[PDB]
Amino acid sequence: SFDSLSPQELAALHARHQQDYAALQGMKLALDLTRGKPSAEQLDLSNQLLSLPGDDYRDPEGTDTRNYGGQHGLPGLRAIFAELLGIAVPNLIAGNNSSLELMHDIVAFSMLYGGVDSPRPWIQEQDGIKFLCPVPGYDRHFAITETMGIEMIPIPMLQDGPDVDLIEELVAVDPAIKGMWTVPVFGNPSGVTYSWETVRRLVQMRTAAPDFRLFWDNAYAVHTLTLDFPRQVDVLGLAAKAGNPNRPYVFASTSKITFAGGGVSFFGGSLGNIAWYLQYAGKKSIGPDKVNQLRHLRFFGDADGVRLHMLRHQQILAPKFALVAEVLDQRLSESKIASWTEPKGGYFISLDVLPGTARRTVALAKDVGIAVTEAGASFPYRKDPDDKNIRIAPSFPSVPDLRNAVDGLATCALLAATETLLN
Amino acid sequence: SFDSLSPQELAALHARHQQDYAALQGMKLALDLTRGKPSAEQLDLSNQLLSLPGDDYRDPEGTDTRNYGGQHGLPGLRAIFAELLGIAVPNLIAGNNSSLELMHDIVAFSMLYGGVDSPRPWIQEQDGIKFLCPVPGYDRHFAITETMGIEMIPIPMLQDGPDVDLIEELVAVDPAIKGMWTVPVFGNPSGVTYSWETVRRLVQMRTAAPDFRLFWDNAYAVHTLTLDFPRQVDVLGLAAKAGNPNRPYVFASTSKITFAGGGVSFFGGSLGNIAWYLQYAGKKSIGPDKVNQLRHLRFFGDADGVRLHMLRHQQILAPKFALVAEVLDQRLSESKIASWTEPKGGYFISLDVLPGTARRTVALAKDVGIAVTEAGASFPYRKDPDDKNIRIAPSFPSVPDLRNAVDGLATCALLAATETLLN
Numbered sequence: 001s002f003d004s005l006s007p008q009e010l011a012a013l014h015a016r017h018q019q020d021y022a023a024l025q026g027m028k029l030a031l032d033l034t035r036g037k038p039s040a041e042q043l044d045l046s047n048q049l050l051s052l053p054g055d056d057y058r059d060p061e062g063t064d065t066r067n068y069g070g071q072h073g074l075p076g077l078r079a080i081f082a083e084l085l086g087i088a089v090p091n092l093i094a095g096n097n098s099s100l101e102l103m104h105d106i107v108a109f110s111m112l113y114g115g116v117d118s119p120r121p122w123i124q125e126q127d128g129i130k131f132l133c134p135v136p137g138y139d140r141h142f143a144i145t146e147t148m149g150i151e152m153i154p155i156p157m158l159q160d161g162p163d164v165d166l167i168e169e170l171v172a173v174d175p176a177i178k179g180m181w182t183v184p185v186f187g188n189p190s191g192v193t194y195s196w197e198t199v200r201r202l203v204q205m206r207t208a209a210p211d212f213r214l215f216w217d218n219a220y221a222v223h224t225l226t227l228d229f230p231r232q233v234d235v236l237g238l239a240a241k242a243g244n245p246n247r248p249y250v251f252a253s254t255s256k257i258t259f260a261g262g263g264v265s266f267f268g269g270s271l272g273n274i275a276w277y278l279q280y281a282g283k284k285s286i287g288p289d290k291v292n293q294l295r296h297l298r299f300f301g302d303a304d305g306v307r308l309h310m311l312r313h314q315q316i317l318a319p320k321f322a323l324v325a326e327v328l329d330q331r332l333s334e335s336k337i338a339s340w341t342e343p344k345g346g347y348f349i350s351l352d353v354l355p356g357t358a359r360r361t362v363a364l365a366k367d368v369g370i371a372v373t374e375a376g377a378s379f380p381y382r383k384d385p386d387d388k389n390i391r392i393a394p395s396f397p398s399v400p401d402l403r404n405a406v407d408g409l410a411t412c413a414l415l416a417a418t419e420t421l422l423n
Numbered sequence: 424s425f426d427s428l429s430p431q432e433l434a435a436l437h438a439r440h441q442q443d444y445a446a447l448q449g450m451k452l453a454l455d456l457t458r459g460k461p462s463a464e465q466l467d468l469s470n471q472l473l474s475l476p477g478d479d480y481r482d483p484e485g486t487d488t489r490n491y492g493g494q495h496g497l498p499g500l501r502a503i504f505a506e507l508l509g510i511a512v513p514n515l516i517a518g519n520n521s522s523l524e525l526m527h528d529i530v531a532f533s534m535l536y537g538g539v540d541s542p543r544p545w546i547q548e549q550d551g552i553k554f555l556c557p558v559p560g561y562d563r564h565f566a567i568t569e570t571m572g573i574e575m576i577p578i579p580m581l582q583d584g585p586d587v588d589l590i591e592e593l594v595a596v597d598p599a600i601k602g603m604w605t606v607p608v609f610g611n612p613s614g615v616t617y618s619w620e621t622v623r624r625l626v627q628m629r630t631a632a633p634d635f636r637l638f639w640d641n642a643y644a645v646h647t648l649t650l651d652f653p654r655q656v657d658v659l660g661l662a663a664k665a666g667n668p669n670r671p672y673v674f675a676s677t678s679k680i681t682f683a684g685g686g687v688s689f690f691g692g693s694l695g696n697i698a699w700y701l702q703y704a705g706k707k708s709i710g711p712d713k714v715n716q717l718r719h720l721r722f723f724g725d726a727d728g729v730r731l732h733m734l735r736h737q738q739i740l741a742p743k744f745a746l747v748a749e750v751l752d753q754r755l756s757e758s759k760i761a762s763w764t765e766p767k768g769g770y771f772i773s774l775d776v777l778p779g780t781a782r783r784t785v786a787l788a789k790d791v792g793i794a795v796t797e798a799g800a801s802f803p804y805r806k807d808p809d810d811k812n813i814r815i816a817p818s819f820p821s822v823p824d825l826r827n828a829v830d831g832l833a834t835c836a837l838l839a840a841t842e843t844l845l846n
């Protein structure tokens with residue numbers, strides 16, 4: 001254990017780490033733990049999509065999916081995800097291949113036009129616009145707010161959601177706070193799922209801004225690492241009962257169900273928000289790709305079809321997550337320099353190494369050929385005040401590559417730890 | 424000859440037309456000439472896309488199209504349209520199913536961020552922003568500028584392009600004019616193709632705004648109604664020789680080549696404009712749908728494959744355009760109340776009836792069950808100052824429906840003419 005270590009014991013331990021690191025570099029590795037994309041083996045599960053939908057190009061309504069028209073998306077596919085998400089079909093639309101693009105356009109519409117009940121477009125707010133950002137969180141959420149000039153306020157994540165006490169306090173006195181980024185199930189990468197009590201408070205709390213929005217990015221809605229699927233909290237129902245029906249914007253995607261970048265996105269909200277979004281989305285496109293929505297409807301068949309498909313993903317992913325946890329445990333637990341999540345779903349593991357050493361750890365790994373996500377990536381402005389957090393993405397590499405990559409990463413974290421202790 | 428006539432005879436002809444209109448009212452019609460979309464017969468030409476790409480999900484470069492990554496689009500598909508458009512592959516990207524969406528986002532980026540060489544974002548221009556709009560023009564272009572609060576200035580269309588003399592005088596002295604909408608080949612709905620000399624002048628003219636842009640929406644680039652395809656003028660090359668390389672934004676689409684709403688879009692520009700667009704598009708999406716780009720590349724094979732496919736469209740469309748022309752000629756020519764285009768390509772015929780009667784003509788047709796595009800639809804703010812222009816969309820209906828609909832429209836146009844003449 002490294003808080004109990006003598007001065008000689010630390011110098012010798014640092015020396016052993018130096019040899020481990022020397023040995024590691026001599027292996028000339030070329031490994032990568034940085035992107036959360038499905039493995040080829042996962043993608044193969046959806047290869048039937050590559051020959052679908054075949055000659056019958058009509059959906060169950062009789063719609064010719066090959067021709068212009070229809071902003072809402074195919075109702076038959078929406079009905080499947082309506083069940084999975086617990087959102088009524090009229091409150092859910094299906095888009096193109098990117099939920100991020102839906103999230104981006106909603107922010108852009110808010111800047112240029114204002115939301116459905118905004119006093120003015122957000123670009124006209126002379127004191128600027130703020131979003132609350134539970135951390136660790138999703139760097140592509142932060143990039144959207146950063147690029148639009150929206151200030152980001154980081155919020156600690158707790159076991160069953162973010163720090164709602166803190167959130168409630170900020171929004172009570174600051175009318176400039178217009179939004180909050182969330183991934184409310186198996187968060188990227190905390191792995192935290194918001195409890196019902198957390199959700200109830202977030203949709204009931206009084207906000208100084210009358211048009212405050214929850215960006216409810218349910219990217220991992222069905223993405224279990226066990227054989228159970230999580231119950232979806234009824235965020236839209238709770239918000240309406242609280243008198244804030246327009247507050248949540250719900251997003252989902254099949255990027256990690258079928259093809260990453262070749263899937264279908266979803267947006268859910270109040271009827272007022274659906275009409276608001278479609279009014280402005282109609283200036284941008286005649287409508288989404290109905291053929292790809294038809295392929296997905298034919299492939300899935302129904303919601304049980306999606307569930308069955310997700311357990312097939314789970315059987316591939318779960319051993320990779322178990323391996324990462326075991327390796328971190330065997331290399332790091334005794335030193336007590338680190339801690340990590342053991343998620344029940346989602347695509348990431350969040351590792352905290354010794355404070356003050358995360359950047360160094362990442363740099364050490366890069367010079368032995370192990371690519372590790374940049375330090376601070378899960379924080380707005382890439383600013384991790386403790387310089388401790390590293391994201392690990394287990395999905396893509398083979399099991400043997402994953403073992404080599406995480407064992408090397410652990411070697412780098414230990415040497416970085418002894419380096420800082422000696423100073 | 425209506426305009427030279429004899430008052431009881433004018434009254435008698437009006438009585439004649441009324442009998443024609445009563446007859447039309449009997450036939451209990453339900454017809455529609457408003458839909459600029461491919462017929463089901465045209466869409467059938469591309470039904471093999473519904474089973475593509477099949478088992479081989481890799482492009483020629485080995486890219487797994489089922490997984491994340493890559494903003495430019497598949498190089499093999501870009502190479503086909505690079506040849507068709509005369510734009511080098513690095514200067515052309517392929518998007519999702521909507522070129523309109525590319526145009527919208529570029530305008531949105533210009534408002535929020537400014538273009539690559541703008542002095543400031545357009546939303547920071549205290550005197551506002553204007554676009555030049557050749558008329559008749561594309562209403563969805565006008566909807567983008569209208570929704571963004573960009574003032575539109577209509578420009579008369581002439582035989583070989585818009586009124587370049589007028590355009591040159593406006594842009595030289597007004598720094599608020601930032602852009603011009605164009606459809607430079609087979610314009611929607613004028614059918615006018617910009618001449619080589621016109622293109623040359625538009626890319627050389629001095630503009631008061633240093634970041635003036637030509638929105639070069641080449642929607643109908645290969646969409647001939649004869650057995651020959653137009654030359655593509657090298658707008659990007661000519662602009663670069665003029666010292667204005669950033670001036671043109673080129674757009675294209677397969678919406679009327681393969682599936683309308685299920686095709687692939689394209690954006691072309693200087694290397695600076697490509698990098699500028701992708702920088703901000705990268706905040707919106709991880710990237711476009713490579714699998715649909717793969718289906719199109721596999722379906723088309725090469726540029727000659729696209730050309731032959733377009734000739735298959737021409738065989739379906741040309742008799743429909745010929746029928747409309749034949750009916751208008753036989754019913755309206757003697758009266759001299761009207762004139763219409765005879766386009767060599769594109770999707771529309773532009774009809775001018777007697778000035779002051781277009782709104783009435785449309786109402787009369789609707790009241791006998793013939794839906795006709797509303798007066799002013801091809802003008803910014805829906806303002807046709809002469810109340811004469813009607814757009815005809817020949818592509819969608821069957822030959823018998825097209826014949827009945829255009830013949831009905833003529834009766835309404837004739838009846839509307841005699842009404843105003845007696846008044």
Ligand SMILES: Cc1ncc(COP(=O)(O)O)c(/C=N/[C@@H](CC(=O)c2ccccc2N)C(=O)O)c1O
Nearest residue numbers: 035036037098099100138183188219253255491709
């Ligand atoms: C919470 C949340 N919301 C939306 C999305 C995007 O989903 P859409 O495809 O529908 O737009 C995500 C996805 N995250 C992944 C994927 C990712 O970034 C990535 C980026 C570049 C190259 C490869 C990649 N694998 C990651 O963080 O690595 C996400 O976690």
Ligand SMILES: Cc1ncc(COP(=O)(O)O)c(CN)c1O
Nearest residue numbers: 521522523561606611642676678
């Ligand atoms: C001139 C023009 N530009 C753009 C578009 C939009 O095409 P897309 O389907 O690629 O958005 C159309 C529709 N045919 C059009 O006529």
Ligand SMILES: O=C(O)c1cc(O)c2ccccc2n1
Nearest residue numbers: 068069286458459460563770
């Ligand atoms: O939904 C539509 O029917 C629609 C909308 C458009 O902008 C079109 C443009 C060109 C051609 C057909 C079009 N059709």
